[PDB]
Symmetry: D2
Subunit: 370 residues, 4 copies
């Protein structure tokens, strides 16, 4: 029993993105969906929170909202030309922020809140008010570039919070581990030339951005050696993800000695996700959380923040999220994941598993960790 913060706000569930057929834009040869048409849907996030409430976990956590991120907070990462364009589109009823970047009315102010929840989570943990913290930040941040929206992300949530903590709370070295199944291209870009932040991304080889693996992208100038990409094979499951973490990430954290670990916590590597091809189950996410909590215990006095990114499986993500929040709080509810055993049976056999283990061995050797 740690004191665990859960930062959320009902207004984050109000952001919308127009009419899509799953995640395809309607029009041309894409027929409008007969029902639901939300690209980045609030339902997964709300269902996680709803399950935390009925399981009895929520009253045992420290619940918080936050003030939105200020214009000054945003300007540590983003230029005003981008910000002004995003706000213009938001203020005028929603629309497109260049192609494939759909937002809705009031999305600007809801993105600032999202980023503000991450800012406050980082601060509460840094000041010792909380041992650790989870931010239910929607819309997500990890694909966002300084001057370009991408992958449903409009502001760089984690970098905004980190930059703000560097300027106002004397934060030093920080490691950002991104286990959303997609590549954290926005985080990578922002800290590419910087040695005061270690950015690690585990992701499906080639998934999004499409065709990017990135094992050879290590950082530039002072930043060289401070960016790690682990492109796992599509189809990998629990054994592979946990081995990448044991074999690459924990050793890399040990070498870098951070003052704070931040997880970019997506659940879209879960076995039922339509936006990737990985095979994780809720125990996978429980075990990964355990491993990074333990690292944090060893390295930075238990200081761990998690910020929600992706996950599109509407009925399965809540179990994965509850599992994380259970591991992070050290409280186990009575909930039993009704798919766990089914997904355990689907996991890749030893041939694939050994092959992926070998690929991860080669990566750790390439990064000087073996």
């Amino acid at each position: 029993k740690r004191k665990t913060g859960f930062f959320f706000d009902e207004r984050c569930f109000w952001h919308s993105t127009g009419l899509h057929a799953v995640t395809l834009p309607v029009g041309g040869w894409v027929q409008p969906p007969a029902g639901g048409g939300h690209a980045e849907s609030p339902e997964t996030k709300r269902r996680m929170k709803n399950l935390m409430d009925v399981s009895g976990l929520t009253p045992q956590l420290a619940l918080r909202s936050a003030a939105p991120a200020s214009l000054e907070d945003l300007r540590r990462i983003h230029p005003d030309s981008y910000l002004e364009r995003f706000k213009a589109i938001s203020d005028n009823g929603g629309g497109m922020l260049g192609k494939e970047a759909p937002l809705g009315p009031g999305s600007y102010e809801i993105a600032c809140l999202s980023a503000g929840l991450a800012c406050a989570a980082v601060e509460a943990v840094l000041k010792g008010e909380l041992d650790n913290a989870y931010s239910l930040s929607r819309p997500p941040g990890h694909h966002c570039l300084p001057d370009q929206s991408m992958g449903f992300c409009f502001l760089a949530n984690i970098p905004i919070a980190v930059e703000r903590a560097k300027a106002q709370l004397g934060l030093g070295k920080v490691a950002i581990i991104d286990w959303d199944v997609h590549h954290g291209n926005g985080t990578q870009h922002i800290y590419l030339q910087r040695d005061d932040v270690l950015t690690i991304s585990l992701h499906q080889d080639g998934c999004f951005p499409p065709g990017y693996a990135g094992e050879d992208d290590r950082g530039v100038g002072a930043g060289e050696g401070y960016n790690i990409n682990i492109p796992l094979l599509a189809g990998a499951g629990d054994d592979s993800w946990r081995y990448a973490l044991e074999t690459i990430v924990i050793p890399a954290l040990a070498r870098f000695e951070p003052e704070l670990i931040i997880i970019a916590c997506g659940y879209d590597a879960n076995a039922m996700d339509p936006l990737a091809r990985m095979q994780l189950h809720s125990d996978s996410f429980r075990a990964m959380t355990e491993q990074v909590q333990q690292a944090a215990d060893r390295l930075c006095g238990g200081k761990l923040v998690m910020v929600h990114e992706g996950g599109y499986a509407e009925s399965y993500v809540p179990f994965c999220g509850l599992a994380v929040m259970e591991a992070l709080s050290g409280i186990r509810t009575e909930v039993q994941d009704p798919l766990l055993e089914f997904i355990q049976q689907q996991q890749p056999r030893a041939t694939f598993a050994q092959f992926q283990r070998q690929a991860i061995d080669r990566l750790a050797q390439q990064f000087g960790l073996q």
Copy 2:
């Protein structure tokens, strides 16, 4: 330009299955979905048909319905105790046909129609009225056992049609190739001891039934050598599926010399499916159709029937289906798959590809085809 039959009936879209959160049954810790709750949804199938209509393809096909399969047709595969129980549940408003087998009111008569469309497709092609044919059979059939519903399947559609054509149309040897991403366990069971039907299943290793691969299950007694399972690795994409077909399936058809090829045609290996982890795109399905049409040209005077099975990606399956129907008819519409290039970029790199190629080489050697 072949004369291509498309067998469908509006009533097949009326079958329902109760309230699910995606495919999880509601209750316990599964919250009811805020919108749509259909496990096996008509929308994918209807959207395929809708796209065939607006693209201008439908008027170029021979459209047909059928009479439902008779009780006598069904009794060539299923015992009366199963049939009577299914009909009882259907007649009484729907319910459960043992656990994980949900059906709705009138589902019995709609399953008989579904099976009847497959019966008529097979017959029209066998009697030379059509060169080839597609049946939009819902509910699906390939998981159904003689006395047990499974995987959303209630009657064994393809075996019913095949048994009926053996009894009434002098049908001899027939090959059934199942490229739904899941294992065709129902077909396998029914023809396991039989040498007059070759059952081939390509499927994701371990997906459904969960934990089953099956490479060593080859047939029993007279049936030995007449069942082929190809458990591809989760994550495999276009290169792998087409290589399994070139390297195992076409050679196996050449050895067996059928009078008719039947595809159990699922689209749930498409890259956006929540019910498996494969990475096929619409050109994948186009190329696989081409390869089996060409085989049929070489072996049985072009006689090819395809029967719809699975596929859960609501916005993507229609493009995969249109692609098949375009390849089967030899008519190319103006439709361009808006995801094709994106999914091509996501395909596994050469390391994985060569590894899966090697695994398929070993399988073909084990089955005496190399």
Copy 3:
């Protein structure tokens, strides 16, 4: 058994309108809907067609599509400034055609088709190819003004067809009876000064446009006496609507002696509609169709066209539509409306009924028909 045309096209179901919470625009204090968000939804229209197919009625009808209405057809009603603006918005991905007028990508070409179905229905009946005809025209037309979209209507479907038949088929006098529950303000405006068309609207007093009754709006100049508005009381049911028709509309048709009767056929006076407060059931719509078919038998050699307008009750409109198509074709299927008896029991008691009868008496006296 008449020869009855049913004009429809799958592409009309592809028009979309963005994200609404029922019919409220999302944003501000309107939370995005957790599921379906279609203001003017294709589902009601598709469900009607689906029910006509499974009941066995569809094969007994003459099914037709049409060529879209040409630019020249549209310019008999609409100026180019409006048309160009509508097309611009459509061509650029959808948007707003002034406030409360939402459309989607490609809506222009789908509106032209909709209007084209009405054009062709009118022509087939006028040339004696069909005895009568129904057009499943979506999007609807009756609220559209020459230069302004309103009430989900973008082109004036019926006026376009009528103007075209006047220019190319020597059409003379025509009566347009609008029993959509809302006021046919677009039709009224277009023919207000004209004595060659009688426009009658039955509508809920004050519903839409909001606050408009219109009993005193009779026509202007040559058009005076050629426009009839019957503002029925909210809450009125079967007895009232059928009495308005017996007492006002049929006598008005007798006085005017048309060559063609066109019904603007909405079903949003049905007892389950969220967009008005009337209490009609499927037998109501059956009886109203009978009365106008009989009038047409007496006045213009049975020449009757019906064009779909409104109706938002997703589960109930199909029964109302099937009823109309049954009455118009003279074919009764086996379908029994499962709500009919329930809605019959809800109908207003004699106090209200006599009061509304008296109000209609006064209207007919004001219009010189009693």
Copy 4:
């Protein structure tokens, strides 16, 4: 600024009812809905709560849950044969509690909670812990009979709470005013022979139960004069409902002198509801709440509890609910109902209004209040 209790629990939103097309059961000629299929949907209730949160009202209220109603609580109203049957169906995965009474897995325990929220609301107000209180009780109660489920109601929520307060808190006379648009037949039956409770129902003449008005049903034996039914005319709006309240209900409360007023608070008389034909807007519900709060100020030291019943308009009910909670708390947020002015314009003209006023005059004279 009163101290206002809001009693709610996330688990009440988890109750489900199977697959319906709006509120029609699927099967036969009712096609399954392509999206959402919830007869009694949690979305209206959740959206009200969500709007209370984003408007800033929620933190100003006293938020509470409750213990479920005990078996002993339930047995003051319901016999064990009914209870055991309801629980059996709930425990076995859901089903039907006789015809048209659909429930889902775990619905029993969720109905007990619902009733428990009402019990606790009544108690907090009676013991002076709160000035007034609202219970977001789902599933609803007012149609439920002792031994029969009806109108989506499974336990008699308000009678259970009232009977419990009579047995444990020395509660005397209580008035129950039911302004859900449907008849409160369950409440009426339970207190029909009793003079210690005044049951008043305003409802749409004939709506549900279908064909029931009830002006002549006044009570039986000791209960005679203690039951008042006001069957308003379908179509009535703000003026009519508020006049029925001024002219019948407040005078009837003055005569009876209660210790507690309980509102059975449905919102299904709102102008956009598909389950009735009334024309109320959010200011209607605000004004009705004001009038009964003021009565309570005059008669029972401000003691007022409201228990949620019906309301099916998903986008409009939240505004009606927020309005009530604003009037009950005495706190006005910044929210402005985006439909208010539109619905004000739709209201029936003076002819209808005077006619309904006269009908209400006659009712008050029949009940000895004029």
